[PDB]
Amino acid sequence: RPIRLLPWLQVVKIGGRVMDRGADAILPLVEELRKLLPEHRLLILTGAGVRARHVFSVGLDLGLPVGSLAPLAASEAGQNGHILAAMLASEGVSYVEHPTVADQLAIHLSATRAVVGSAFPPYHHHEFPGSRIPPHRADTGAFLLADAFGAAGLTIVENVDGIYTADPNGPDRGQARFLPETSATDLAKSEGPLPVDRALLDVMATARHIERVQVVNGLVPGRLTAALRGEHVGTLIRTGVRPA
Amino acid sequence: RPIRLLPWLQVVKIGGRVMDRGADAILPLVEELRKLLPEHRLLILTGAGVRARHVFSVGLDLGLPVGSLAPLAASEAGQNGHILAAMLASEGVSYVEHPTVADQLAIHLSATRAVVGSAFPPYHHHEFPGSRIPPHRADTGAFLLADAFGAAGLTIVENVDGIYTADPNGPDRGQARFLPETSATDLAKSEGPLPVDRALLDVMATARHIERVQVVNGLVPGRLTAALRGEHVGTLIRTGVRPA
Amino acid sequence: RPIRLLPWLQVVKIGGRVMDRGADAILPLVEELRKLLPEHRLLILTGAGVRARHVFSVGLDLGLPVGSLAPLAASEAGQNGHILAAMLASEGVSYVEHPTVADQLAIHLSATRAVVGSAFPPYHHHEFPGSRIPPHRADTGAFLLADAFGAAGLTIVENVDGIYTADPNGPDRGQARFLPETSATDLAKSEGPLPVDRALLDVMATARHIERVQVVNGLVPGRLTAALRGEHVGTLIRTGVRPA
Amino acid sequence: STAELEELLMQRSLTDPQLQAAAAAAADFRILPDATVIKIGGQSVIDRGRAAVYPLVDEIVAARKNHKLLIGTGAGTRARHLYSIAAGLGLPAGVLAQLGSSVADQNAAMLGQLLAKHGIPVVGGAGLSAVPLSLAEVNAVVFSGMPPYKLWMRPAAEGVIPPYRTDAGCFLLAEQFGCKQMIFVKDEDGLYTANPKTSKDATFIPRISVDEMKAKGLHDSILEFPVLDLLQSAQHVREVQVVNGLVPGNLTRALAGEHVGTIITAS
Amino acid sequence: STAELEELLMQRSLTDPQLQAAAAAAADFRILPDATVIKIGGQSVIDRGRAAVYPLVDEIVAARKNHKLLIGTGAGTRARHLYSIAAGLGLPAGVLAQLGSSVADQNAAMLGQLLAKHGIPVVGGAGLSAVPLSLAEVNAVVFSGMPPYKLWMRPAAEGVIPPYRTDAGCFLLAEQFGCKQMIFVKDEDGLYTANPKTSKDATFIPRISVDEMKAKGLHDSILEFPVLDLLQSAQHVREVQVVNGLVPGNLTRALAGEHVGTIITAS
Amino acid sequence: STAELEELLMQRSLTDPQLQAAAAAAADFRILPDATVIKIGGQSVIDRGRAAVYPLVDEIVAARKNHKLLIGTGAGTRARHLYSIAAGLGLPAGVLAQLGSSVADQNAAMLGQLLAKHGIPVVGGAGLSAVPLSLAEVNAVVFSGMPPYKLWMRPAAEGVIPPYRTDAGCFLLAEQFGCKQMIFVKDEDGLYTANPKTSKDATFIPRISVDEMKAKGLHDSILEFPVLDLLQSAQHVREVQVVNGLVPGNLTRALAGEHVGTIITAS
Ligand SMILES: Nc1ncnc2c1ncn2[C@@H]1O[C@H](COP(=O)(O)OP(=O)(O)OP(=O)(O)O)[C@@H](O)[C@H]1O
Ligand SMILES: Nc1ncnc2c1ncn2[C@@H]1O[C@H](COP(=O)(O)OP(=O)(O)OP(=O)(O)O)[C@@H](O)[C@H]1O
Ligand SMILES: Nc1ncnc2c1ncn2[C@@H]1O[C@H](COP(=O)(O)OP(=O)(O)OP(=O)(O)O)[C@@H](O)[C@H]1O
Ligand SMILES: [Mg+2]
Ligand SMILES: [Mg+2]
Ligand SMILES: [Mg+2]
Ligand SMILES: [Mo]
Ligand SMILES: [Mo]
Ligand SMILES: [Mo]
Ligand SMILES: [Mo]
Ligand SMILES: [Mo]
Ligand SMILES: [Mo]
Ligand SMILES: [Mo]
Ligand SMILES: [Mo]
Ligand SMILES: [Mo]
Ligand SMILES: [Mo]
Ligand SMILES: [Mo]
Ligand SMILES: [Mo]
Ligand SMILES: [Mo]
Ligand SMILES: [Mo]
Ligand SMILES: [Mo]
Ligand SMILES: [Mo]
Ligand SMILES: [Mo]
Ligand SMILES: [Mo]
Ligand SMILES: [Mo]
Ligand SMILES: [Mo]
Ligand SMILES: [Mo]
Ligand SMILES: [Mo]
Ligand SMILES: [Mo]
Ligand SMILES: [Mo]
Ligand SMILES: [Mo]
Ligand SMILES: [Mo]
Ligand SMILES: [Mo]
Ligand SMILES: [Mo]
Ligand SMILES: [Mo]
Ligand SMILES: [Mo]
Ligand SMILES: [Mo]
Ligand SMILES: [Mo]
Ligand SMILES: [Mo]
Ligand SMILES: [Mo]
Ligand SMILES: [Mo]
Ligand SMILES: [Mo]
Ligand SMILES: [Mo]
Ligand SMILES: [Mo]
Ligand SMILES: [Mo]
Ligand SMILES: [Mo]
Ligand SMILES: [Mo]
Ligand SMILES: [Mo]
Ligand SMILES: [Mo]
Ligand SMILES: [Mo]
Ligand SMILES: [Mo]
Ligand SMILES: [Mo]
Ligand SMILES: [Mo]
Ligand SMILES: [Mo]
Ligand SMILES: [Mo]
Ligand SMILES: [Mo]
Ligand SMILES: [Mo]
Ligand SMILES: [Mo]
Ligand SMILES: [Mo]
Ligand SMILES: [Mo]
Ligand SMILES: [Mo]
Ligand SMILES: [Mo]
Ligand SMILES: [Mo]
Ligand SMILES: [Mo]
Ligand SMILES: [Mo]
Ligand SMILES: [Mo]
């Protein structure tokens, strides 16, 4: 088994659609994050949200390949990260670039309590072919990092309570049953949309350290605080990493 | 009104002509800065001084436009910043680049008590046309940053006591009356030279947070210490930002 | 005499051949380094080792000049530094790049107790001609930095006890007598191999601050701890800088 | 002569009127005098996708055979979304300026990938991209139109929207490099007395000076209003042309000297 | 049409099968359709020094007169040494991936210095290195073959060796830029039924599909096994050719359409 | 053969005389054999402004038609001002070296802006700037002449002035890239027995070896004295030429093989 590089680290991924709600959603989340700073050492990673859909719409209309779209969407996650970091600047928090996250996170988390980065992985023009939509997005990037570091946890902060049997905002609203607990293998066998990347389920299958990931609703204050303490307030996804 | 990003920050701009005096002026200033480190969180920004005049002389002789001269002068302010930072290295102070000041100042001021940067703004080849001399120089850059961050203050450290009615080292020496207090609007209506950029007066008119700026003599030990405590030891420039 | 920029700094250079031994040598060294973190402020610099010999073998076979080989070997020292930094990441230690070591070491050592860098100096394509083997390697780079900063000390960590009269792993094994103490001038007049760069002896002749350098065996736990406390556990090289 | 200027540069403050007058007498060197700067609108063109971009790519490829081009990109709707999120949080103009740059970079990347097979690169430092601009096989570069001000952006009198965006960014580059022409490629034929999307009896204006535009109090958001003040202070580019990029061959016609669209003059 | 896709992109999750099906109907643009990507093996070629590299440099210089080339480098024995040191410490695949990149960069630097006098640069961003690829005097670029994943490298099912190395790095670049050909330059004539360095009666395979290779359970480490899965999902590069770079003129012959070596097809 | 060298490289220390002797037998590859390196003096030329720079720009533009040029810039009076401020504070040579680099970069930027319309770029990595050096339309690059040593600058025996400045920086580049010629463009006709600005009966020296210069104890600060020792150890550039750039056509004449100025030989 590989060693844990930063065993004391907590990684939090904030969905781009949470950021897309603006001040109504960001201000209570910022206030909750401020209160968490003295409790944990955090790597906060942001997703892309709706602006990545607009750039996919233009990019696909121009016929651009999947490797062209990947860095364009990643830029949106980076911009959400600069917005979130600016809101926490007075607390000593800043946005750090991917090379800094990859090689110097330890020194940055010694200087301050949290840093913000883009959750997108730097696959760029070397994105895998197959789909016209880049498969390695924000949930996948956040998990790859969390598992590579051997982090204490990974929490995914969404605009929904967790994973449902169908899209709770889609045509099948009435058939959507909440799943309090699931496994990566069980979700992989399912058809239908998910609020997490499908590639996340693939990387969870080969995970070395992270045993569970929780998907929580960032629109309900207190849920992120509770999830970071291990409380069951959303959907728990078991990765298939067996403990001792 | 925009929010204050770093409300606890004190910005100090050291004139390039103060640095041009060498060890006789720099060593007492360094000693005074060392004593200030435990008292404030400082962003120290350096001006350009005489070497920018030499590069303007060569550059104008070659017929180069204003956007060509701006980064050439900025380099001189950067070099003064490396000299000042080296003198304070034993105290944990270093020079930080413009991208770091713009996006990561909070983390750097969490690690250490002060950092040094170039006061010149990165207008570069996108400098405004009109004059053959770049208008957005060190005083302007320091103010734009101080006001964007919502800093607790901005102090300008010069080789003179403050602003006079005429150049106290110029032909009209005898007509030069010291101004203890003035406003950006009053100075803007005046003709004649100033020890501050004319563009500073324009940006002070649209300021969002900084109510006053003090110009002090860095050649008199103790004045910078006093100015940072709000004592009236030079010229106070009111910006026209009205308080509550 | 130039001023000491970081008088409280201890510089340690770890030989690339120590790293080449892998886990058997690295794990006890990492454990000893962990225990040293609360005692000293360290700049840890890594050498290149055997992989630089392989790239010299390929590079010389292609007829490449000395300035082409220098950055190729330096890359190996950089890779050893990333490996060592990853082992100490949980303690707040990271690898920092040459521009960061040159201009921002003070801030990085204020955030954390130690940083790792490549011991190779950035001579690159401007390496001196004369030999087909780059003369300014890891020992030389570590010394140039230690002396430029006015560091409290420089310790060289090798896979041997110190300097012998002949290579203790070479054909003349039986004629190899251990030297507990020597001077840069005495070693310079000698023919035969050394476990330190010949260029190190040249830069020691013009040194401004470092009076002595100790070469210790990193394969014997405790020797690095003892050397950092000034104990005589290897070869002491006097530089010819006379004290007060 | 240069002897008086050098003496004044050493002894006087840079704010001194005597020094300012002497510096104004210096020779004027044009760095890239044969180049034309074009701005491809973000919201007006690139955001419209294939139907707007593909015909313009063909015009650019044909035009570079006879004209040296510096093609700047606008930002558009993704920047407006970032500006509304950030403005709602009370973030200052300086933060918004950095967010807007990312959108113009995305647009330059998409345009550059359609032009790569024709040898046209996406660059940083367009005005000094001496090699691509000197080759007949290339003769053009694509650049992101946002100015580099970032946190040092001069804010507007009110609000947090950066007042110097991609129209100002492209114009200042034309101005600094002493280019021969500045063309804004938008989605309207040019300037009208009233808004062409609002009013019914808005008349077309083929030519106007900045003074006349100010005096007539024009409600035309076709050009960033701070660009008009920059145009009045400009040393090299004393006129700009606004053309509709949605009309086939309009950019080709403008480069050929046809008076398509509106010409805005400094005086 | 594009109207349904834009509606789905806004309202559905990107994991939605309906959205995925609609995005698959989008037009297909090839960025660099006339280029050939070649991988020069690290262990198989560059590590062998002068005897292997010098003849290949001459073939590249001759070949670029008629073929646009993107030449990627492998890593080889110094990367294997780094991987064994790091694996022994229990460092994860993500750390090993960064170490491996340094070795491919060293190899690109050495190759670039032998090619500099012929005008061929070492670049970052090969696929978009529009200027060198558009000039008859240049028509080629050298790049480091390691993918940029670094710490975000997808690990293998077991062990810490990065599964996506320089074969995958060069292949994905050929695929993303829509190149016409992908040639792997190694030190074996091609694929054999058994290992050519181990078994005695291993038969040569001139052509095979990924499915047949999987079905026959081939013990040939000539190509990184994850490259075969990428090849099956590829949109642009549906076949690859493996040639022996130690045979004089083999790369020249492959570029001329000769069926030297083994052709591996997606289906 | 290479078999003995590879064995010695693995088993012996790099300081071993046997290894050093074997490495000296390796083949010698010249990276840019057809290029000429020129140093444009900072204090001697660029600091003089228009009267000195404009005629040299015209010579460079004319000369690049027939000669591949790498043009390095000196630093000059702004660097001397930085050195006196920093020396007075007791800052070490390593800090001064970084300050000096900024001045050489400013000079390269000014020269590059005058040359941009002729297609000549300012680069980083001149010796490997393969694309501009291979095109007849370009055939030249401008680079900053300061070496990259920064804090790792070898100090002089006494004082804090960096001993390796822009003469050494340009020379080492000529040497490393195996260039055919190295020309120093200064403001004196060449070397004299005594200082031409001090003594009255100083005689001109058209040709001299480094040994003779040392033996005659020359008081000529025309060339940085450490450059003379580098010249004696050089493998590729065994002679340098010092010319007066203030004399019209002197650089053109030197490139044509005329013996204008002084030739300094290694032996
Ligand atoms: N099975 C499902 N369970 C829950 N939500 C679902 C499901 N299928 C689809 N969704 C939808 O996914 C939405 C979340 O959108 P998405 O995951 O794309 O946003 P995000 O995570 O914020 O974006 P990003 O990945 O850029 O960070 C939910 O609001 C919900 O409508
Ligand atoms: N009205 C004035 N009141 C005071 N000083 C004036 C006035 N007009 C001109 N000056 C001159 O301005 C000088 C300060 O020079 P200047 O402001 O250019 O230097 P600096 O601020 O150190 O430079 P930099 O802007 O590069 O940091 C004073 O020494 C004084 O001679
Ligand atoms: N006189 C000598 N005394 C001691 N060791 C010697 C002597 N001459 C040669 N050596 C050899 O030098 C070896 C150390 O090798 P070397 O100095 O190249 O490695 P390193 O310092 O780890 O490498 P790097 O310089 O890349 O960090 C010793 O193991 C020993 O065999
Ligand atoms: Mg989601
Ligand atoms: Mg001033
Ligand atoms: Mg050694
Ligand atoms: Mo950065
Ligand atoms: Mo960075
Ligand atoms: Mo990087
Ligand atoms: Mo960096
Ligand atoms: Mo890099
Ligand atoms: Mo950085
Ligand atoms: Mo990219
Ligand atoms: Mo940096
Ligand atoms: Mo940076
Ligand atoms: Mo930047
Ligand atoms: Mo950076
Ligand atoms: Mo950047
Ligand atoms: Mo610039
Ligand atoms: Mo960096
Ligand atoms: Mo850096
Ligand atoms: Mo640098
Ligand atoms: Mo940097
Ligand atoms: Mo740099
Ligand atoms: Mo290099
Ligand atoms: Mo940037
Ligand atoms: Mo950028
Ligand atoms: Mo790009
Ligand atoms: Mo990109
Ligand atoms: Mo690019
Ligand atoms: Mo570029
Ligand atoms: Mo950049
Ligand atoms: Mo940039
Ligand atoms: Mo940049
Ligand atoms: Mo570049
Ligand atoms: Mo530039
Ligand atoms: Mo630049
Ligand atoms: Mo370029
Ligand atoms: Mo280029
Ligand atoms: Mo890198
Ligand atoms: Mo790199
Ligand atoms: Mo390179
Ligand atoms: Mo290199
Ligand atoms: Mo390079
Ligand atoms: Mo490049
Ligand atoms: Mo790079
Ligand atoms: Mo890179
Ligand atoms: Mo990079
Ligand atoms: Mo570049
Ligand atoms: Mo790129
Ligand atoms: Mo790029
Ligand atoms: Mo290039
Ligand atoms: Mo380039
Ligand atoms: Mo630099
Ligand atoms: Mo630089
Ligand atoms: Mo530049
Ligand atoms: Mo510049
Ligand atoms: Mo430049
Ligand atoms: Mo370049
Ligand atoms: Mo650079
Ligand atoms: Mo640089
Ligand atoms: Mo650099
Ligand atoms: Mo470049
Ligand atoms: Mo280079
Ligand atoms: Mo490079
Ligand atoms: Mo270039």
Numbering used by the authors:
A (entry chain A), B (entry chain A), C (entry chain A): 33 to 276
D (entry chain B), E (entry chain B), F (entry chain B): 4 to 270
How do the authors describe this structure?
To examine the time needed to adapt protein crystallization and crystal preparation for SMX, we selected the soluble MOSTO complex whose crystallization was previously optimized for classical crystallography. Room-temperature structure determination of this complex is challenging because of the unusually high metal content, which makes it susceptible to radiation damage. After a simple optimization step, we were able to produce numerous microcrystals suitable for SMX in hanging drops. After embedding these crystals into LCP, we collected 68,788 indexable diffraction patterns in ~6 h with much less time necessary to collect a fully converged data set. The data extended to 1.7 Å resolution, and the resulting electron density map is of excellent quality. Clearly, high-resolution structure determination at room-temperature by SMX can be fast and straightforward. In the case of MOSTO, where we initially suffered from low hit rates, we used a very wide but thin 40 × 5 μm2 beam. In combination with a larger nozzle size, a larger volume could be “scanned”, allowing to collect a large data set within 6 h of beamtime while still obtaining data to high resolution. Based on the average indexing rate, data collection times for these converged data sets were 82, 3 and 10 min for TD1, A2AR SMX and MOSTO, respectively.
As opposed to cryo-crystallography, room-temperature X-ray structures reveal realistic conformational flexibility that is crucial for protein function. The most direct approach is serial millisecond crystallography (SMX), which utilizes the same high-viscosity injectors successful at XFELs to distribute the radiation dose over thousands of crystals to determine room-temperature structures with minimum radiation-damage. To demonstrate the general applicability of SMX, we have chosen three real-life targets: the radiation sensitive molybdenum storage protein (MOSTO), the αβ-tubulin-darpin complex (TD1) soaked with the drug colchicine and the thermostabilised adenosine A2A G protein-coupled receptor (A2AR). In conclusion, we show that SMX at synchrotrons allows fast, straightforward structure determination at room-temperature for large soluble macromolecular complexes as well as membrane proteins.
